[PDB]
Amino acid sequence: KIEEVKSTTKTQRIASHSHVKGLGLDESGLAKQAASGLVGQENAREACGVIVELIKSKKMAGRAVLLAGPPGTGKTALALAIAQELGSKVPFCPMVGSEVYSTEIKKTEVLMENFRRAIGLRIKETKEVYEGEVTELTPCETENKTISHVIIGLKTAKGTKQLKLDPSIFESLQKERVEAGDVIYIEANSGAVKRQGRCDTYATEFDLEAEEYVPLPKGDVHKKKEIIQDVTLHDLDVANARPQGGQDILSMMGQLMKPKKTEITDKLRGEINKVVNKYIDQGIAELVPGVLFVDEVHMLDIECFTYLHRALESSIAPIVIFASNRGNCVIRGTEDITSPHGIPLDLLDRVMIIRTMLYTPQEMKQIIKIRAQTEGINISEEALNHLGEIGTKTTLRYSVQLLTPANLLAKINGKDSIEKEHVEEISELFYDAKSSAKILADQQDKY
Amino acid sequence: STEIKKTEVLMENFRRAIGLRIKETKEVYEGEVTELTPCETENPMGGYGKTISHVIIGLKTAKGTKQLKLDPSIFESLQKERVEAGDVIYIEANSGAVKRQGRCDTYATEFDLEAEEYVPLPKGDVHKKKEIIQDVTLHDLDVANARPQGGQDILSMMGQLMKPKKTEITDKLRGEINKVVNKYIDQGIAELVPGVLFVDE
Amino acid sequence: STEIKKTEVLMENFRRAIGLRIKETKEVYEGEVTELTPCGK
Amino acid sequence: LLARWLALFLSLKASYRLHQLRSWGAPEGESHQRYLRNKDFLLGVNFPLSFPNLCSCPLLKSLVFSSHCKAVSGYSDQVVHQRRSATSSLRRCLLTELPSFLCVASPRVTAVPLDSYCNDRSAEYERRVLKEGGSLAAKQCLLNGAPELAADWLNRRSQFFPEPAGGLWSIRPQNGWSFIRIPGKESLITDSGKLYALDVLLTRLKSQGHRVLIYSQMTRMIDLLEEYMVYRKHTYMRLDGSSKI
Amino acid sequence: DVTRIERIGAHSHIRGLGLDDALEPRQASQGMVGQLAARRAAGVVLEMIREGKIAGRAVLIAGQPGTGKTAIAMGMAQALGPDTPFTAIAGSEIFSLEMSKTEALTQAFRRSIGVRIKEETEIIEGEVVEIQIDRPATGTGSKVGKLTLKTTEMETIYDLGTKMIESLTKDKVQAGDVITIDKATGKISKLGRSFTRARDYDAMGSQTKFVQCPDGELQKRKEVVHTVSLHEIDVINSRTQGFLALFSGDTGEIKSEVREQINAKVAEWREEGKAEIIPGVLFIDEVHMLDIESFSFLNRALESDMAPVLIMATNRGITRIRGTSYQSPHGIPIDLLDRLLIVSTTPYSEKDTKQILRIRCEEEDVEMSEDAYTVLTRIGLETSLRYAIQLITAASLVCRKRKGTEVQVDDIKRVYSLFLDESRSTQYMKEYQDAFLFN
Amino acid sequence: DVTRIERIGAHSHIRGLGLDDALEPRQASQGMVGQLAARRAAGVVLEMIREGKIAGRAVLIAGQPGTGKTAIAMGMAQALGPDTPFTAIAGSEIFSLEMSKTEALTQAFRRSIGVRIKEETEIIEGEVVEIQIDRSKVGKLTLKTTEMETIYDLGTKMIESLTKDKVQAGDVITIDKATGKISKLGRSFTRARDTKFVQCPDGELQKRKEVVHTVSLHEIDVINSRTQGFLALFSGDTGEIKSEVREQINAKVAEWREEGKAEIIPGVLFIDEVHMLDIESFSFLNRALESDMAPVLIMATNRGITRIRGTSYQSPHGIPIDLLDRLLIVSTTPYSEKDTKQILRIRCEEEDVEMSEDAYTVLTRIGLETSLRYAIQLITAASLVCRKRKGTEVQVDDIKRVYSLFLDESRSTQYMKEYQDAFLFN
Amino acid sequence: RKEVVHTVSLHEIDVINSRTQGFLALFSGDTGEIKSEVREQINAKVAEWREEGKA
Amino acid sequence: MYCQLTSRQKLLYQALKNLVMQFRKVCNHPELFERQETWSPFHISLKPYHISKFIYRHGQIRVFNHSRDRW
Numbered sequence A: 001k002i003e004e005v006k007s008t009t010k011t012q013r014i015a016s017h018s019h020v021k022g023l024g025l026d027e028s029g030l031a032k033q034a035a036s037g038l039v040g041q042e043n044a045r046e047a048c049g050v051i052v053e054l055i056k057s058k059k060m061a062g063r064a065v066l067l068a069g070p071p072g073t074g075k076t077a078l079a080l081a082i083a084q085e086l087g088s089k090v091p092f093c094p095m096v097g098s099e100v101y102s103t104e105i106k107k108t109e110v111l112m113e114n115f116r117r118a119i120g121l122r123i124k125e126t127k128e129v130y131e132g133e134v135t136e137l138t139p140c141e142t143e144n145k146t147i148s149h150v151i152i153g154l155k156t157a158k159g160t161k162q163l164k165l166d167p168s169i170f171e172s173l174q175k176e177r178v179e180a181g182d183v184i185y186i187e188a189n190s191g192a193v194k195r196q197g198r199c200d201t202y203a204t205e206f207d208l209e210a211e212e213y214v215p216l217p218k219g220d221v222h223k224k225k226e227i228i229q230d231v232t233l234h235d236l237d238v239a240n241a242r243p244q245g246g247q248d249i250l251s252m253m254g255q256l257m258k259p260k261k262t263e264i265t266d267k268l269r270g271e272i273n274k275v276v277n278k279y280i281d282q283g284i285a286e287l288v289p290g291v292l293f294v295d296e297v298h299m300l301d302i303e304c305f306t307y308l309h310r311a312l313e314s315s316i317a318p319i320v321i322f323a324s325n326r327g328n329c330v331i332r333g334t335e336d337i338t339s340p341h342g343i344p345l346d347l348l349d350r351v352m353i354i355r356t357m358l359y360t361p362q363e364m365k366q367i368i369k370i371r372a373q374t375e376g377i378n379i380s381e382e383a384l385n386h387l388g389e390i391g392t393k394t395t396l397r398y399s400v401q402l403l404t405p406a407n408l409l410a411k412i413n414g415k416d417s418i419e420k421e422h423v424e425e426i427s428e429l430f431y432d433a434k435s436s437a438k439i440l441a442d443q444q445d446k447y
Numbered sequence B: 001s002t003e004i005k006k007t008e009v010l011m012e013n014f015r016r017a018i019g020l021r022i023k024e025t026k027e028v029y030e031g032e033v034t035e036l037t038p039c040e041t042e043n044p045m046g047g048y049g050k051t052i053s054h055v056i057i058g059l060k061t062a063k064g065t066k067q068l069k070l071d072p073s074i075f076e077s078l079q080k081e082r083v084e085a086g087d088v089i090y091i092e093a094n095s096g097a098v099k100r101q102g103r104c105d106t107y108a109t110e111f112d113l114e115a116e117e118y119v120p121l122p123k124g125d126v127h128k129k130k131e132i133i134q135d136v137t138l139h140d141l142d143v144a145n146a147r148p149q150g151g152q153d154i155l156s157m158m159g160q161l162m163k164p165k166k167t168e169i170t171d172k173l174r175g176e177i178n179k180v181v182n183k184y185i186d187q188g189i190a191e192l193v194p195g196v197l198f199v200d201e
Numbered sequence C: 001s002t003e004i005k006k007t008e009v010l011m012e013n014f015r016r017a018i019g020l021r022i023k024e025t026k027e028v029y030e031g032e033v034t035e036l037t038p039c040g041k
Numbered sequence D: 001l002l003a004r005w006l007a008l009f010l011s012l013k014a015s016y017r018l019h020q021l022r023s024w025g026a027p028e029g030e031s032h033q034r035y036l037r038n039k040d041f042l043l044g045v046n047f048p049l050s051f052p053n054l055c056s057c058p059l060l061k062s063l064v065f066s067s068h069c070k071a072v073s074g075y076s077d078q079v080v081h082q083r084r085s086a087t088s089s090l091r092r093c094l095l096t097e098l099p100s101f102l103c104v105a106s107p108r109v110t111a112v113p114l115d116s117y118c119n120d121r122s123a124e125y126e127r128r129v130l131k132e133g134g135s136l137a138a139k140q141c142l143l144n145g146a147p148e149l150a151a152d153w154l155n156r157r158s159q160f161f162p163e164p165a166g167g168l169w170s171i172r173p174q175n176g177w178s179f180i181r182i183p184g185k186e187s188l189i190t191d192s193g194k195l196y197a198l199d200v201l202l203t204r205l206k207s208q209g210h211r212v213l214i215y216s217q218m219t220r221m222i223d224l225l226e227e228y229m230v231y232r233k234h235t236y237m238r239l240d241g242s243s244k245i
Numbered sequence E: 001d002v003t004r005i006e007r008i009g010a011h012s013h014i015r016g017l018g019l020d021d022a023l024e025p026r027q028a029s030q031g032m033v034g035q036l037a038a039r040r041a042a043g044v045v046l047e048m049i050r051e052g053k054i055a056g057r058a059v060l061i062a063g064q065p066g067t068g069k070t071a072i073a074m075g076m077a078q079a080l081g082p083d084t085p086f087t088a089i090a091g092s093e094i095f096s097l098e099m100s101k102t103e104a105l106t107q108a109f110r111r112s113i114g115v116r117i118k119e120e121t122e123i124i125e126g127e128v129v130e131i132q133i134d135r136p137a138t139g140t141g142s143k144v145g146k147l148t149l150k151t152t153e154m155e156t157i158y159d160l161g162t163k164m165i166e167s168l169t170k171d172k173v174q175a176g177d178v179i180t181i182d183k184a185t186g187k188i189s190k191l192g193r194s195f196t197r198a199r200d201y202d203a204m205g206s207q208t209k210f211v212q213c214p215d216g217e218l219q220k221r222k223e224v225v226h227t228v229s230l231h232e233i234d235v236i237n238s239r240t241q242g243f244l245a246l247f248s249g250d251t252g253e254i255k256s257e258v259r260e261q262i263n264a265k266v267a268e269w270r271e272e273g274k275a276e277i278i279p280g281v282l283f284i285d286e287v288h289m290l291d292i293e294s295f296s297f298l299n300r301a302l303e304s305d306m307a308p309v310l311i312m313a314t315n316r317g318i319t320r321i322r323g324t325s326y327q328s329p330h331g332i333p334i335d336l337l338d339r340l341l342i343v344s345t346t347p348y349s350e351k352d353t354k355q356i357l358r359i360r361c362e363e364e365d366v367e368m369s370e371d372a373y374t375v376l377t378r379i380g381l382e383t384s385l386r387y388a389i390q391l392i393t394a395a396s397l398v399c400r401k402r403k404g405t406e407v408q409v410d411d412i413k414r415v416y417s418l419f420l421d422e423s424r425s426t427q428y429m430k431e432y433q434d435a436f437l438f439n
Numbered sequence F: 001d002v003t004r005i006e007r008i009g010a011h012s013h014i015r016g017l018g019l020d021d022a023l024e025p026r027q028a029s030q031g032m033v034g035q036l037a038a039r040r041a042a043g044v045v046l047e048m049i050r051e052g053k054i055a056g057r058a059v060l061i062a063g064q065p066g067t068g069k070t071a072i073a074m075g076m077a078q079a080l081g082p083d084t085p086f087t088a089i090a091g092s093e094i095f096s097l098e099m100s101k102t103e104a105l106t107q108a109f110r111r112s113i114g115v116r117i118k119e120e121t122e123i124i125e126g127e128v129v130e131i132q133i134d135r136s137k138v139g140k141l142t143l144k145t146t147e148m149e150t151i152y153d154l155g156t157k158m159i160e161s162l163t164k165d166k167v168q169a170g171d172v173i174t175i176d177k178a179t180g181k182i183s184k185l186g187r188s189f190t191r192a193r194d195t196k197f198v199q200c201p202d203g204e205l206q207k208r209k210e211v212v213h214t215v216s217l218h219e220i221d222v223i224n225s226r227t228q229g230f231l232a233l234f235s236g237d238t239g240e241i242k243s244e245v246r247e248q249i250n251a252k253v254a255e256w257r258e259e260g261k262a263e264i265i266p267g268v269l270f271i272d273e274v275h276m277l278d279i280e281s282f283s284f285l286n287r288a289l290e291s292d293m294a295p296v297l298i299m300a301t302n303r304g305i306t307r308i309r310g311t312s313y314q315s316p317h318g319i320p321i322d323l324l325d326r327l328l329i330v331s332t333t334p335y336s337e338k339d340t341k342q343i344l345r346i347r348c349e350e351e352d353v354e355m356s357e358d359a360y361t362v363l364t365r366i367g368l369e370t371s372l373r374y375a376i377q378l379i380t381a382a383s384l385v386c387r388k389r390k391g392t393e394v395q396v397d398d399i400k401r402v403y404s405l406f407l408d409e410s411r412s413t414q415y416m417k418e419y420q421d422a423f424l425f426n
Numbered sequence G: 001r002k003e004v005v006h007t008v009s010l011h012e013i014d015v016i017n018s019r020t021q022g023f024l025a026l027f028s029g030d031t032g033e034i035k036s037e038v039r040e041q042i043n044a045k046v047a048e049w050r051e052e053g054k055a
Numbered sequence H: 001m002y003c004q005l006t007s008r009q010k011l012l013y014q015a016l017k018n019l020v021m022q023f024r025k026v027c028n029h030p031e032l033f034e035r036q037e038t039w040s041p042f043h044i045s046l047k048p049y050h051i052s053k054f055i056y057r058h059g060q061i062r063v064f065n066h067s068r069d070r071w
């Protein structure tokens, strides 16, 4: 008789690049005219094609490319297209040029955090663990007396064992306030203890208690498992520099204090490199060297640019992508010196430059269409042509930005779609950079 | 300031120029302890050897001596405090807490040396009461909430052995303090005095 | 410096340039310990 | 830094004793408008909002609410409901602890603190002493808060109304100190659209009072249904073909 | 007599945008008057904020000093209401000594995305009849006990657990206390004493006002809505037991790996229906204070799917971008100005000026004659609007000091002689040109 | 194959500094070519480093960009190798937020002078054949090599060590007899039944092994600085290290040097891009180069007569005459066509790619039109278009394709002059 | 048995009241930005002691 | 009554689209296919930092200067 269903969970939010799904190549490496949500830019998309081959080759260290071209030309969108084309597995580290100016560590070292974060590593961590209901807890003592050894009895649905354990595990059980009848998990590699709560066998022993009870664990008490960890080299560099691991008073204390950054010594990266080369030679690991993308690179300091010379040459370093949108600009921190793209010529020799074209009106229409069917809105043909008309006079971003304001006006007067009168009305409310600069230059006596 | 951003030094001074005027009672019992006398019930409850209904503490002050009656949980705390007859002690009537000040000055001769500073006998009655009209700036509330001073945890002791630092107090703490001083101003508990900030130069 | 004011680094170095010259006898005992006997009472 | 800590712990004891003496008498000047006294430079107790006065006054203790070991969000209104009649009322501006599940970030990696091996019999006792914690005084001082608080904690089981611990033992973070995670049982619902649909039907039917049978194909599915039905305490019974006659 | 913490300030009369349901501005409504073009536009972006589907959209409000840019910003703050987060930043506030600019903006963004959680829990709310606590003669410490609670209708006995016993005894709970216990949290709370059992009593154990005995069933539900920003979710996750950092603001430059992980787990709580996400507004007032370093952060921050709707305001013409040589519109780089829609405000007529002064006098409880409004309207066109808004209270106070009930024209001419307009002070600065310093 | 952390980078092809015994460089060997003047000069500097006897000395490698000034400085590091400290920094790496700019150079100067010592240790190594224990305590151990066996009476501090570390019969173990530490190497192959497996040691069980060890002079400062020093060595908490501690440690090492219990091993500081230093930092190099513990330092620069940082003054190399007077300047030179093609062959060996001889000719033309470095970057991208084409070898039309995909700086700058108003600022 | 005179400068009373163990900073130098609420409390107290004749 | 796949199920369902009871199991509950593992951070130790016996005997200013440090 009846049919029933439900769904009310909100979507992910729509965003200024969420229509980008890939580079839209064919198998020859040519760009399709419009595919994967992109249009145009073939002379750049083919080049980005060679760079996604370059990442997936793993062979190179410190190769770098610069996406250059006017505002609104899609340089960030193409860098996102590279990120989508690599999929989830390979790390892509986004960065903005003004992020180097930390107040906690030198600019020159904030770049090394990102360089070490853009190299990914995969590990088969063969952990082993004890878990169960604690049926017994009995410490053992030694000469001047103090604790020396521990008995813990554990029980699970598949058996029970009377374990013999290190007195640091007793100190750790005491810290977690573990008692008989508690269900606990112990990571034997790490001394770590997690108290889940009392076993459900005791679930009504009081009318009130603060606990939430848990079911008795399944399988044997003592067992090992092949956990697969995805981690960056930076996550090895930092965890050794201010360790929260282990069970002692010093690590337990150092976890609570303010987590200031610190200027990591090269010798520690030397140890991490020696360690991970052993994990690769044992066949435990896989390395996944990925991408560092520095958007707005043109306001790195000449300190940073002169450090990038040494970084991009390092046989460790990840592949790099830069973006810039500047002409013959003065390089920040130099005051005297003007160069292409806001980048010193000394660095500009070290990058393969990808040149980004401006759009024709007939490409504006096609981006705007693809954008409207991403915003989730319907538009009539003369209305879409009027956004293209505006796009010839103004800029690509402005013609996109008029869409949803017009869609609100459309449904505020009950229509299903944007009509030209809704775009034409919206253009009277929301000025652009060009038209505002006119009225602001006319009225300049009053501002 | 070197500690904190320019605009926050202005925002703190904008919060110094507003005062609460908040009035409350203090009530306390204090005096030299003349005796500690637990009082039994001749019938115990079933299965137990003896039972106490209350403890009497005799307290003395320059105005007189009074036997206070107290619930028997006090006797546990009166052996956390190392109390002996002829100490001077006080009990917070709004809270039930008890504290020891020292041996009473009348006994400051029973040894030629002893390792405590002797306390003069309290004056006024054994039970004291007053109102006080306390005043605090909203900036005092901002700092007292941003950096608590009670020591019964390692974060507070560590935070109190470390150097004190001015910190960029969030618009959320300002928000919560505004929400609660309204709760008391509506009830007539707290007066408010919008003050003046004067900047020279 | 980045931990102290410029005038402090002058003052520290002005104080490194004045020396005390203290005389004491060095007195070393060393060897295998043959016994220990502890000997208010 | 050990003597710093003990001299601090005693100074808090001295603060409550000073505050009473400082606030309940006015015997003019000590030899007729002459002579200061021991502790007279300690003025940190004269502030109305200082801890001894703030604890002695019943009311200021509520304007200084952000205590160092509680998850206070700030104030909110609350609603309370009767089970019978569905009648409800509003509580205006009360403190709230944050929900028990916002603490969900973790280090990706947790390294052992670095250790200096050395090739000498006298040297290896020193790193051993450091691995223990270098005196029982300093160890008890961080772990339980002060050596008197440790000596007390060892017997607090024998006291009716104990004080809080002062140490690292004063702290209890929402997950415990370990980052290791066992999946929350609510995940059974939110992993299956069928099990989510079932929970809204069982809350529908339990509110209506109807008796219900559930049929499934797989004994491994009946295990999943049972662990859900146990977790929501619905009452349950199962008769798979592996049940005895 | 009574006076709450919030009082009559520079925008307290504004209570919304005064739009009809067709999204047209009424000539005077909700405290807004005149200014049709910008109020219309503000209505559209307010509707876009309530829709919330789209991320990182932005608006710059522009026009003369003293023409309601901030008025319209507060108008939409009140029209949006308290349940959806609106963060006001004056552009100077990001220049911290505790943290860098890109951190201070990332905090200002993430403070402006709300995660909303219903906490529903079962409470016991009752009056204590009696308690028994049992303690071993020495032993391992296996404490046990019983507690009893009442209402005006019902009462019952609870057999107590081990952690309950310490939480009860920690707060000195006793017969005659009224308490509210949360069964899931394991936490007590104290409401006061009932009038009854407090007679069988000693030298004082407490001093507070009594509370009436609780009614209905002894066990009852509670519901709370939390509004927790992404910023405080990141701070709580930055260090264990970090909860005080939400108030002190002392956590600087939070690890990127926290934000990366919270962006995932906040999406999971939406897909579980466990928490709502409610994207709000960031109002960067006076944005021409941001450096070109900070604008270049906004270029690439304002394209995250977690970005709030961002509103600038500014009053500057062609002026150089702070921290650089380059002249540009509004003091903003075209790198950013290309990305956001500009809403243009307009100067005021006699009608608008008089109508603004009239709605201001209503909120300040002032009576003035139409002649006094005529001269104040003249003053508000001969001089900037804020000076006229500054004579109103002074004229009401001079009127009160001479015990008048209504402000007359000569009360305003008195106050105009007494407090100077900038244009008149900067004129007197010519006679004393030898006596003021550093011209 | 698998990839370790080190992969093919901008200097990976350089495996030394190819020289005859005469300190004359042959045309191409050890992975680098040409630069006959600069490489003969670098040979003489490499001998001054290896001799060690002269202290506080400097060479500045200067010349046009792309001329191998980092190449010879990186080859010199490979030729010097382990067992002598070499440390590299970029000039903008000393500008710490957390440490004085002048102290950061003082650390760089003293990472790069080594102390070397030798110590003798009684080490026991063998397969554990059997282990026994009782309830004070007593117990018995047996160890085996391929050439002997023993039984042993254990003492209490060993008993607690063997039992703590779960040492089991059939392990192969090393016992640090001075310290009670146990290292386990694996299990014997004959007990691999019921992981890592290994053969028993050779020779006798108890060897009085000699260990040579080296600590950088700075690494002694950090050990001395804190209640535990070595944490601050790795974690970077070393900052403003108290100069009276250095005044003691330098004088202490100066007596170990001559009582003969230690020897000091002068290393190298390579302060790359030296023109980034302020005149404040040059004022430190002016004087820190005149003390016995100073290493030799190599500095590299590519600047003409230029404004020195922190002033309006212009001087050669971007260095004040103040400091240039301390040092010897070796000039690199711009490459000829022959050397240019030969570098491209060696990069093609190091990247492992084949290309046509006329492909090497057109790529050499591109190299001479674009100052080499851009042509080196085309090699890899050409091979990737060849791989897209399923080609065996890079052809001229693979290079002409990739040359149109990726612009050099000159064509990029020329195209930036067409749309000159569309980019921001000029 | 005697009374004695101490001279102590107002800054030391300001530092001693700045934190729980403030007197260590009189020697260590490691203090700065003393809260203005302390300095104006010390004015009131030191003026009060002068009116009470005690200092 | 109809049901969507959950956000986690859709991944495994596509892997099956790329043997009908192996297909039903994932659609019914993903714990029938793979149980959610007990996650924990990656645990690591470096080498212990080796300090020479010579440096430990003669090489700390806390030790070799103790007679001076007394003054």
Ligand SMILES: Nc1ncnc2c1ncn2[C@@H]1O[C@H](COP(=O)(O)OP(=O)(O)O)[C@@H](O)[C@H]1O
Pocket: A016, A017, A020, A037, A038, A039, A040, A041, A070, A071, A072, A073, A074, A075, A076, A077, A078, A325, A367, A396, A397
């Ligand atoms: N080729 C393209 N294909 C699809 N979307 C594009 C393309 N070029 C630009 N866009 C879109 O238009 C806007 C401007 O591009 P963007 O990458 O932001 O420019 P810019 O490099 O100057 O910062 C973004 O919404 C972007 O996703």
Ligand SMILES: Nc1ncnc2c1ncn2[C@@H]1O[C@H](COP(=O)(O)OP(=O)(O)O)[C@@H](O)[C@H]1O
Pocket: E010, E011, E014, E031, E032, E033, E034, E035, E064, E065, E066, E067, E068, E069, E070, E071, E072, E315, E356, E385, E386, E389
């Ligand atoms: N349209 C308006 N309706 C009502 N009051 C307004 C209006 N425009 C401005 N005001 C009021 O006049 C004053 C000037 O507005 P303000 O927001 O401060 O100007 P702006 O931000 O543009 O410089 C404020 O007191 C404000 O409340």
Ligand SMILES: Nc1ncnc2c1ncn2[C@@H]1O[C@H](COP(=O)(O)OP(=O)(O)O)[C@@H](O)[C@H]1O
Pocket: F010, F011, F031, F032, F033, F034, F035, F064, F065, F066, F067, F068, F069, F070, F071, F072, F302, F343, F372, F373, F376
């Ligand atoms: N002599 C050489 N033999 C082999 N490769 C060289 C040689 N000289 C330069 N190279 C290569 O050309 C690049 C340019 O020289 P480099 O030393 O890096 O110049 P610079 O330091 O001025 O930027 C080197 O990084 C290396 O890849």
